[PDB]
Design a protein around this ligand. Sequence first.
Ligand SMILES: *[C@@H]1O[C@H](CO)[C@@H](O)[C@H](O)[C@H]1NC(C)=O
Ligand SMILES: CCC(=O)Nc1nc(C)cs1
Ligand SMILES: CCC(=O)Nc1nc(C)cs1
Length: 340
Amino acid sequence: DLRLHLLLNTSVTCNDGSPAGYYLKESRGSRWLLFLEGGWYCFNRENCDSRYDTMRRLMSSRDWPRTRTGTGILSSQPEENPYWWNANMVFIPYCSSDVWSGASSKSEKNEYAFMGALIIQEVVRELLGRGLSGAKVLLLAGSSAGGTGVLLNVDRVAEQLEKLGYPAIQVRGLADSGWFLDNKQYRAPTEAIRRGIRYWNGVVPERCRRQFQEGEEWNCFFGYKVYPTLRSPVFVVQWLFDEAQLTVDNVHVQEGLRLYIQNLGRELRHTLKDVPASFAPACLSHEIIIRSHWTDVQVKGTSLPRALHCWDRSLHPLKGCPVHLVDSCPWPHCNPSCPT
Ligand SMILES: *[C@@H]1O[C@H](CO)[C@@H](O)[C@H](O)[C@H]1NC(C)=O
Ligand SMILES: CCC(=O)Nc1nc(C)cs1
Ligand SMILES: CCC(=O)Nc1nc(C)cs1
């Protein structure tokens, strides 16, 4: 079990002004995994009000429980988590509705606070006094909106630790199910994100901002565009036929739809050709890393926990221990190990 700590700086808040926080389980014999929860987002007063009625735990800490159980990559049992398992474990709840990009407080002009980028910085800050100062690796991981959040924030964490005087901590990223395409729909994300950035005062990585310039920062929310601007090592996990991608594409089988689905998989595979650390199975699904049975899926005979271990070794190719694992077969569940 991981134990809740609300942020000591109570000006760093969830949407409704309640304090943000993190859940922690220390492992004193180990030198850190910080995981970003996902859960869509909201981009105007009306749709944020709706989310506050029926998804309030994603906008407030008032009802959070005192503990949570670590699962998947957050599990401390080697049977469930062959990778790491002995690491210090941190789960950061998503309560900012801003894909972890916001830097704006609640005020007389703002009904809600959007502080995702500042929540991450404050968590890292308060952890340094609880043992993070002695770390050798900090892995910033996340699923869905949290996976996009890794891409937007990993280099800022590295810069923060350098400026605070901790140059020996190696910061790395693991982005799960947050690598989306701004593609043609079958019957939109780009417009919703463009409006969100204005509403949230959203921030993107500096090198990506300088490429796309004012008004075009929405481009940096799309993995294949922001990834080449990043300096920290990042491992990318993405289903080739992601259910959230298909949902925004208005897909819920005749020739037209067959060709659309096959072209989606081919496009995703193309965007990963130059990503040396990646795991991309040919399955229709969504998310992976915090599921208890995350060890079952294999690409070309290699599981995700093994691929991550091989990545660790590469950061010290390796005989029989690969890190670039992308299916080439063209239809959902052509890989027999896909989740049932
Ligand atoms: C609390 O966080 C805010 C936002 O980052 C910052 O401006 C302020 O200085 C912090 N306060 C303290 C006491 O650290
Ligand atoms: C919130 C996760 C999701 O389904 N969609 C996202 N789209 C972008 C562009 C970031 S997160
Ligand atoms: C990167 C060189 C290499 O093979 N690394 C190794 N790591 C272990 C754990 C044994 S050898």
